Design a protein around this nucleic acid. Sequence first.
RNA 1: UAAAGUUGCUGCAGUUAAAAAGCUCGUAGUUGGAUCUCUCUCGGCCGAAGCGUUUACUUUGAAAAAA
Lengths: 149, 216, 82, 186, 83, 129
Amino acid sequence: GRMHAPGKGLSQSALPYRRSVPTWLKLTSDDVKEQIYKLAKKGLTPSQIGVILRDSHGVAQVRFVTGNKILRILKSKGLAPDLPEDLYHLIKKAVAVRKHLERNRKDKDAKFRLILIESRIHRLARYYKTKRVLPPNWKYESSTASALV
Amino acid sequence: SGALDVLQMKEEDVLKFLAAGTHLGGTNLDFQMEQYIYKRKSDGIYIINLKRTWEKLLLAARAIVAIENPADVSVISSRNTGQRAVLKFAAATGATPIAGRFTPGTFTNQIQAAFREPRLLVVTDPRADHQPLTEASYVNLPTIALCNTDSPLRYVDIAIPCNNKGAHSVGLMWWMLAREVLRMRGTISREHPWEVMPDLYFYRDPEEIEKEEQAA
Amino acid sequence: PLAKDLLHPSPEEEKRKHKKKRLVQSPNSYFMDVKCPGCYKITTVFSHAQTVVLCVGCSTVLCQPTGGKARLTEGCSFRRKQ
Amino acid sequence: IVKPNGEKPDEFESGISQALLELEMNSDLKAQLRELNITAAKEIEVGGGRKAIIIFVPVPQLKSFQKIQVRLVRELEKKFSGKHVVFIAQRRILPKPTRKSRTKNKQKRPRSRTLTAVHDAILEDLVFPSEIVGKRIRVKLDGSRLIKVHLDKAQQNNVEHKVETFSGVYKKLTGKDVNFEFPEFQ
Amino acid sequence: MQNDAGEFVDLYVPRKCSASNRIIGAKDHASIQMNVAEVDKVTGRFNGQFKTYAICGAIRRMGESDDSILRLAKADGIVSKNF
Amino acid sequence: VRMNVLADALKSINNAEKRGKRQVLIRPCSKVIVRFLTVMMKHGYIGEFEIIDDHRAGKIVVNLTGRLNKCGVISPRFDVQLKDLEKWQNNLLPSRQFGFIVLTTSAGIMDHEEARRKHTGGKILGFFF
RNA sequence: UAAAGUUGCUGCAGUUAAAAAGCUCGUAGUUGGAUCUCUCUCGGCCGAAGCGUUUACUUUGAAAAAA
Ligand SMILES: [Mg+2]
Ligand SMILES: [Mg+2]
Ligand SMILES: [Mg+2]
Ligand SMILES: [Mg+2]
Ligand SMILES: [Mg+2]
Ligand SMILES: [Mg+2]
Ligand SMILES: [Mg+2]
Ligand SMILES: [Mg+2]
Ligand SMILES: [Mg+2]
Ligand SMILES: [Mg+2]
Ligand SMILES: [Mg+2]
Ligand SMILES: [Mg+2]
Ligand SMILES: [Mg+2]
């Protein structure tokens, strides 16, 4: 089930059994990598890049074509954000909730949701510290959060 | 029928089934009566596969013939539509008929007047003859039933997927079962049609009796 | 009930189950070749697209996303791939 | 065209290299075979009298080989007497690390250098004209195993006659028993 | 069943259900021992030989004796393969 | 969350055995599960089984013969010395004429009698009879 | 002390007989999805030296006062 909700949904993606690139796809690995670089320079997260490639260019799975994931390709090129995208989104949502809450003191539900979001942020930050993706002094503080993202 | 050509279903039997409407089921389907169904058409009516019905009827006939004493087979009908068919089946085959009400304790209460010890049981409807079915479980009695699309199969060993609602269908099923039993016994032959017609097993419907009485 | 071949489900049995509950997972989606009447270019479109797909040559809206699938613009033709 | 790792060629390798030179000279695929090369070759007996040729080619050229695979196989089968010719890549096997293992563990073993990965790659490349859509493993009552491989239906007619030679080649190389089937559809 | 000397030491050997292989006890009164007649392939009359099936009461209460009998008859060739 | 795969597989097998089913589907697969099933099959309790290979953790379809009374797992996996095996046999087995305790030893995964023959101990996985 | 499976690790209970925190978050603790089949040199095949990424486990052996 959900980490912070009672829901127990099952909606997700199921990749096909075959790992071979389809015959109709005319794109090569280098062309896909160039498209990825152009989209990243445009300012798109890897998830958006994958969505665009799936919807428009018929690229079902970049890892099947180029043999590598989007984030690793960006890191090899050097066009990678300092902090991971999911943590960035969590911090941005926490900032938005905190900005809403300061003008609405009686919204206890906003306080509850902010507590949940900050707990998830702490979990993700500790995990990323364990993998050394973040320095072992990075801290999430409410005041610093606005400047962080 | 072990794929034998002699035991295959003929065209006239198919015509009789189509005329009697035995292939027409109910709107409800039992989850254990789904292997004998063919397809659900519009208006919710389920259609029964007649080949599987023929296979089940032949298996029931084989089960009946294996009993040495013909009197050890009991045929029971509670509804009025099946009483005449059961009586004719018993007369033609030599079984013991129970038409009308079944007295509880017939198979268990050994001091009653109607106490009996049948070796095989044939019923017309599991949902209407449930009382004889339940008492079978007490005395090790195998059971044969004429089931429908919506019919419980508890304590039923050989289920014949026919239409047990209409009088014509019930009479035809009983007549065909009797014919198959007699042919397997070696009494009548498979080379010529049986002398008795299947209309002798149908329900009289005393309205029809009154109509025929005033015909002349 | 008490007698069922799990190794060999029928083809209709496996298209009625949930995509995850099958013996081997298989998506219900597909890619298609679409063509608008104005312009001759053929565009590859994912069935469950989430973005508006524009024709590169002539800037024609090929499809609009919805909750389940993306609906093609009127007059546009499509054919499944493989 | 033959560049063995051990630098020691044989008679069959020489003959196959001569055939490849003949195909370079007398066919339209000059540049491809000029750039490409093979590592080794072998012959086995399968199917109660049939013979199968196995062409071990380097891994960095397997993808380029797959471009001409069908035409090259046809030309080889026409040049040689009735046989069955299959192209397989050259995969290295690294032993599993152990407590008593020596400085051969100075680098972590790549997952590609694994017995299971190599066997899967060999099986995938063995039947190249047809894709693999499913795999089943049956454990017999005596403990033995049997591998059933499902192949694509669209390429059934191309490799339907080579199934037995595939089962022979895999048994000779991997040492396991494998069978091939063509399911109806999904 | 038997001792080290090999002599069999039991009152009786109970029969097992043909459908589920379960033991049919002495007090199981819902069990059935049914016989299905065999016919001659040429004439179709009663051969005089029959095949015996035994079903325990647990299966019958589940309403699974019909399918079990059908499968047993199909395996023995009594029921047509294209049933 | 799921923390033991052998426990789930054995529970599924036992539940399907109680209901009189002919085949059981167990997922996910594991080589420990395959070893346990092989040990059970060598003694004739289950029969042949087939491993369906999807690209994620696999599945197993097991045929049943109706000879299995109880198959179960012991958690946590306790260390068993060769001199403490008789106590586990008394506690877990129904009789001294049948039933097997399954152990994982340094030689491999086997039953208690085969571990007595090879004079080795290990960790208890489960039992079946 | 056993009886006491009425202190329950083996091995107890918690709808109505005694009993589950008003609800949620959360550190420590506990638990955690699949997957990977001896070595050169120096000395007389063995001797020295490095072993083992290390453990846990199991099986040996040695040392372990009598009463
Ligand atoms: Mg939680
Ligand atoms: Mg979702
Ligand atoms: Mg005490
Ligand atoms: Mg005690
Ligand atoms: Mg007390
Ligand atoms: Mg106890
Ligand atoms: Mg108490
Ligand atoms: Mg109370
Ligand atoms: Mg409460
Ligand atoms: Mg914690
Ligand atoms: Mg694990
Ligand atoms: Mg001492
Ligand atoms: Mg002492």
